[PDB]
């Protein structure tokens with residue numbers, strides 16, 4: 061994993077995730093990001109490799125199982141996805157790609173209904 065956060069002691073992301081609420085003990089381990097609304101990150105292309113395929117992964121859950129999440133990734137393409145959390149934590153994965161090492165950013169957005177929980181968000185290189 062290139063970038064990782066556990067919403068506890070570890071976060072090596074080069075930019076901040078917005079709207080992070082970790083005052084809970086509902087994580088896969090420790091604390092989770094309790095998502096109410098949107099959490100977004102802009103990662104400069106200076107902090108990523110060019111012409112690379114990546115996977116944005118993580119774990120989500122909704123104990124009341126009545127909510128869903130839109131994942132939007134703005135990279136080479138601008139693709140949106142539909143994520144339905146289960147009652148307990150399960151892993152999600154979404155591929156995206158980079159092009160040139162310009163001064164643009166790739167953008168990762170998670171937008172949920174109600175209250176959902178996110179933990180151990182990673183960005184990993186593939187090929």
Ligand SMILES: [Ca+2]
Pocket residue numbers: 066067068087088089090091092179180
């Ligand atoms: Ca955690």
